[PDB]
Amino acid sequence: SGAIYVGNYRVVNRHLATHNDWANLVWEDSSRDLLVSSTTAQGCDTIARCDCQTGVYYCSSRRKHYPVSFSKPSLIFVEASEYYPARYQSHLMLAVGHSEPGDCGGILRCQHGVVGIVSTGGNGLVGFADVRDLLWLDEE
Ligand SMILES: NC(=O)[C@H]1CCN(C(=O)Cc2cc(C(F)(F)F)ccc2Cl)C1
Ligand SMILES: [Zn+2]
Numbered sequence: 001s002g003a004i005y006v007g008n009y010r011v012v013n014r015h016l017a018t019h020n021d022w023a024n025l026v027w028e029d030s031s032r033d034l035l036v037s038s039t040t041a042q043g044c045d046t047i048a049r050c051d052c053q054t055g056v057y058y059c060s061s062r063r064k065h066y067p068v069s070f071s072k073p074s075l076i077f078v079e080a081s082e083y084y085p086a087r088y089q090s091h092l093m094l095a096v097g098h099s100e101p102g103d104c105g106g107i108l109r110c111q112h113g114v115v116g117i118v119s120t121g122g123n124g125l126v127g128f129a130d131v132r133d134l135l136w137l138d139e140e
Helices: none
Strands: 004-013 025-029 034-044 054-059 064-069 074-078 087-096 107-110 113-122 125-130
Touching: 004 113, 054 113, 054 125, 064 087, 087 113
Parallel strands: none
Antiparallel strands: 004 034, 025 034, 054 064, 054 107, 074 087, 087 125, 107 113, 113 125
8 A cells, every 4th residue: 555645646556546536536547557636735745757767665565665776667568466457557667576466555766756656566576657757746
């Protein structure tokens, strides 16, 4: 579990969005596993606006933050799970690291701010849904 809080927005994994998120929807994209809902109070996370390929992510299944190298956002085949059939997920970045289903939502951060959130895993890999291209998160 986990979310990004920027301005009057809450960014979560689409597959983990609550009834309250759908009842206050801003934008969602099934192919990216992202959903953004509106909030009453202002958030303080800063979104990174960069091309960094190294950062640190939080892994709830280990209660630990790990430094990682990760690939550039791409269209990657993701195996079927209980939330989606087998499909290409877009804007996804992979790293070598531990990830379990409940780790989705963990933040990946570089020196510039929040890069994305854990969205995929298995086989000793962890995938992150990129949020750096969502420039509108910084306004309105
Ligand atoms: N974005 C997606 O398609 C997500 C939705 C939920 N997803 C998962 O459960 C994938 C997953 C599998 C495993 C494994 F290998 F142990 F089975 C470990 C971690 C994760 Cl995140 C994909
Ligand atoms: Zn950066």
